[PDB]
Design a protein around this ligand. Sequence first.
Ligand SMILES: [K+]
Length: 144
Amino acid sequence: KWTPPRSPFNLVQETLFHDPWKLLIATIFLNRTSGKMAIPVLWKFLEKYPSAEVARTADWRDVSELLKPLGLYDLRAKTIVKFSDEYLTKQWKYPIELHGIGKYGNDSYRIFCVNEWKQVHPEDHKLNKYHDWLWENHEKLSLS
DNA sequence: CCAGCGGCAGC
DNA sequence: GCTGCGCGCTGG
Ligand SMILES: [K+]
């Protein structure tokens, strides 16, 4: 089974990879928002909405109240509910096919959730740091 | 003090 | 191709 390695850069994707919905929600939380502020709120969100199954039933106004100190709160609250609906009920191969996930979320999924990191060409700086480091260290970490 | 900064959809 | 969304943190 593909386990992405921990890096000296401590991307939150390294800990969330096991649950692709939670990883992708985290990428949404990090859209133009510092991890220092977003990630504490992420845990409160996941306490209230532990799964896509329940998040797709949420009132976006309740989600936006949680997102308020992060900015982009009405936008992302509506995104999270629709994303969670499509994640479960739309046929998809890569999550870029889903509302709210672009290249950054998709590259994140393809590096962390599935074993496709060698095919990914990130433009995100933090993904580039992790991905460059992976190419330089994957042999030492005994990964293919 | 406060401008700059930490993705995505819809055009 | 550009713009709206958007708070709190950063640092001279
Ligand atoms: K998409």
